[PDB]
């Protein structure tokens, strides 16, 4: 019988294997609703005549 929840051992002295890394995963959702979140929009100069 053991505890399912344990704590990280993060210490600056450990090697790159045990070093803490922040992993933020980007989750995309697609439904019948319109897309309200998109990338940047680049523009150029306007020329006339």
């Amino acid at each position: 019988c053991y505890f399912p929840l344990q704590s990280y051992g993060f210490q600056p002295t450990y090697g790159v294997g045990y070093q803490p890394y922040r992993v933020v995963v980007l989750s995309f959702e697609l439904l019948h609703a319109p897309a309200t979140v998109c990338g940047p929009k680049k523009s150029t100069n306007l020329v006339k005549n």
Partner: protein
Amino acid sequence: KNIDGYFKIYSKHTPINLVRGLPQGFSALEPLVDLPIGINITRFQTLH
């Protein structure tokens, strides 16, 4: 109104002189904002 999930909000504001009913006249409604929500609404109520 709801078109393919787009909520189209139309608005017009003008002063009138009205005893009761509706006045006789013609006016056009300008769009306010477009809400890309896309949820189904089968009923509505008025705020008190």
